[PDB]
Write a protein that binds this ligand. Structure first.
Ligand SMILES: *[C@@H]1O[C@H](CO)[C@@H](O)[C@H](O)[C@H]1NC(C)=O
Ligand SMILES: *[C@@H]1O[C@H](CO)[C@@H](O)[C@H](O)[C@H]1NC(C)=O
Ligand SMILES: *[C@@H]1O[C@H](CO)[C@@H](O)[C@H](O)[C@H]1NC(C)=O
Ligand SMILES: *[C@@H]1O[C@H](CO)[C@@H](O)[C@H](O)[C@H]1NC(C)=O
Ligand SMILES: *[C@@H]1O[C@H](CO)[C@@H](O)[C@H](O)[C@H]1NC(C)=O
Ligand SMILES: *[C@@H]1O[C@H](CO)[C@@H](O)[C@H](O)[C@H]1NC(C)=O
Ligand SMILES: N[C@@H](CCC(=O)O)C(=O)O
Ligand SMILES: [Cl-]
Ligand SMILES: [Cl-]
Ligand code: NA
Lengths: 189, 342
């Protein structure tokens, strides 16, 4: 998955999230065209596959011909009451996409973190099943303590949680940030 | 340098692709032109993540009409697919049978028909060069190559481009994508039809089937990107948030944020350890309540999600869930009432 955010000079905007699903998709590359094919069929639920311990299938997300599989993707554009874009945001990184997108919005909109900080700020994730709270390596450990004393079992993500690209309107114009977890950098004028 | 820009901005996950997007804007492109040009480049530099073999969604806001739209160009199950076609995760994750019908290029075409200002071919030009000339492998791709070292090294058609002397490329080493360069060139000149009903089509079907897949020419001919004029929105303060409904996770996002909005988070919510710890606790619980309802979601053309989605975007419902969040404890799974049937 990759997320990209754009704001043009006229104030129009695009939030685009694209994916071939797992790393290198199906692992099928065409020797002639070079196209690397998705494994998006894996995003369906299957009745005979035991996905996770104690997690049943979701019948709403079973394979039918012509059906699109459920996705965690959520490319978002926030617009102010005056019609001007306020934030362009989304994420990559599997089931953590939605939680990470929520966190980036919370961080900027409510906690007052500037866009770069909103992107770089440590994240955490819980998706109910499985039943564990994952936190990034550099999270404020007072947060970890607050969670554990409230009976969350936490564990630390061996790499990182998601990748966020974002743009936010400021008095100085359009502030952009790409996530250092993957190494991107924005550009503009 | 600082990444605050007076006029326009592109935030991609590779520097050169953000730049390519930015140049398109400079040369008179719309935000859509820039997004397509940048996406084409990301498909090269982060080929593990996305590309013309996959699918996407675009949320687009027009500053003039003050309207938002969504373009759905996500992959679909092929016409020969069925509910019980897979019996292990390995079957659904590897090989041609794991492949759904790619929508990427029809999505770029629809967006471009609606919002493009630059010529189609111009959007591909810088990525054709890049693929043909080569580029140093970035951090993100390098870690992805390391992660799948084994499968890549043992697969000669992937190692062809993703190795140097039989071993996966590392950060700094040169990656060239000479076949994709030709493919991008054909796309630029013959348009989207080359992929779906044109000079690339039969080779696509052949590659997918040779690897055990079931995609046919008919699937490609029939794929359509979909314009959604009324995306999901929620109201947050004086703002509106536009995001895609099912089969994407806008409704999950909506529910998380509507749960949390009744706590009136501010700078104070994170100023002391006491407030901060409680705040992050409340976030996790909102995540759990929202993921509970997620298991009822699916493609709305195949499954009736009208009321589920209605609830997931309702502030009242979110308030009902917030009132069940205990400030002193998390709860067992059943507490959140995950549902697998209506
Ligand atoms: C899985 O089992 C079903 C039912 O026997 C069968 O139709 C299908 O072809 C099998 N698929 C694979 C990939 O083994
Ligand atoms: C917004 O729509 C109007 C008319 O519908 C059009 O003139 C304008 O170019 C559009 N903006 C973009 C960025 O497509
Ligand atoms: C292209 O178009 C039509 C159906 O749209 C079909 O008859 C024809 O065989 C297709 N050709 C290819 C190469 O897919
Ligand atoms: C939000 O969506 C609802 C239902 O489709 C509708 O009341 C309204 O027009 C939307 N709001 C905006 C600002 O587009
Ligand atoms: C929606 O929410 C209400 C509670 O506010 C509940 O009675 C109803 O069952 C829910 N509907 C669906 C379709 O889940
Ligand atoms: C889930 O984690 C919570 C943490 O307290 C615990 O209460 C519960 O027993 C765990 N297991 C289930 C099945 O909910
Ligand atoms: N294919 C998944 C995302 C996979 C990933 O980011 O690793 C989705 O659309 O939700
Ligand atoms: Cl990304
Ligand atoms: Cl190639
Ligand atoms: Na930045």
């Amino acid at each position: 998955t990759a997320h990209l955010s754009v704001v043009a000079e006229d104030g129009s905007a695009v939030s685009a999230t694209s994916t071939i699903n797992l790393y290198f998709g199906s692992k099928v590359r065409s020797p002639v065209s070079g196209i690397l094919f998705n494994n998006e069929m894996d995003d369906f639920s299957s009745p005979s596959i035991t996905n996770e311990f104690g997690v049943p299938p979701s019948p709403a997300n079973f394979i039918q011909p012509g059906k699109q599989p459920l996705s965690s993707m959520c490319p978002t554009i926030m617009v102010g009451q005056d019609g001007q874009v306020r934030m362009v945001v989304g994420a990559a990184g599997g089931t953590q996409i939605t939680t990470a997108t929520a966190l980036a919005i919370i961080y900027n909109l409510w906690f007052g973190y500037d866009v770069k900080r909103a992107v770089e700020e440590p994240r955490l994730h819980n998706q109910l099943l499985p039943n564990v709270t994952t936190v990034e390596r550099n999270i404020d450990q007072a947060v970890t303590a607050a969670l554990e004393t409230r009976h969350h079992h936490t564990q630390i993500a061996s790499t990182f949680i998601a990748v966020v690209q974002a743009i936010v309107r400021t008095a100085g114009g359009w502030a952009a940030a790409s996530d250092s977890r993957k190494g991107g950098e924005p550009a503009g004028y | 340098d600082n990444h605050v820009y007076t006029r326009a901005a592109v935030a991609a996950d590779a520097k050169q692709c953000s730049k390519i997007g930015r140049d398109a804007l400079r040369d008179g492109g719309s935000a859509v032109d820039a997004a397509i040009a940048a996406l084409l480049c990301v498909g090269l530099m982060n080929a593990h993540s996305m590309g013309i073999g996959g699918g996407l969604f675009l949320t687009i806001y027009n500053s003039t009409t003050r309207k938002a739209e969504v373009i759905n160009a996500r992959e679909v199950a092929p016409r020969l697919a069925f509910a019980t076609m897979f019996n292990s995760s390995e079957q659904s994750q590897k090989g041609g049978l794991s492949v759904a019908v790619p929508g990427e290029i029809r999505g770029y075409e629809l967006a471009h028909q609606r919002h493009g200002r630059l010529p189609w071919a111009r959007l591909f030009q810088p990525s054709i060069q890049l693929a043909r000339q080569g580029f140093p492998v970035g951090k993100g791709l390098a870690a992805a190559l390391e992660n799948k070292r084994t499968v890549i090294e043992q697969q000669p058609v992937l190692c062809e481009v993703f190795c140097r002397d039989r071993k996966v490329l590392r950060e700094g080493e040169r990656l060239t994508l000479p076949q994709l360069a030709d493919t991008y060139e054909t796309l630029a000149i013959e348009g989207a039809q080359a992929f779906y009903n044109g000079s690339l089509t039969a080779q696509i079907v052949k590659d997918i089937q040779a690897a055990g897949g079931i995609v046919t020419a008919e699937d490609l001919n029939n794929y359509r990107a979909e314009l959604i004029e009324h995306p999901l929105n929620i109201s947050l303060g004086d703002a509106v948030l536009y995001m895609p409904s099912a089969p994407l996770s806008g409704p999950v996002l909506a529910l998380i944020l509507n749960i949390l909005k009744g706590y009136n988070f501010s700078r104070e919510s994170v100023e002391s350890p006491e407030q901060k710890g409680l705040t992050y606790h409340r976030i996790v619980e909102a995540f759990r309540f929202a993921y509970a309802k997620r298991t009822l979601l699916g493609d709305p053309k195949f499954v009736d999600v009208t009321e589920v989605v209605r609830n997931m975007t309702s502030e009242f419902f979110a308030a009902q869930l917030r009132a069940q969040i205990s400030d002193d404890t998390t709860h067992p799974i059943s507490y959140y009432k995950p549902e697998f049937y209506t």
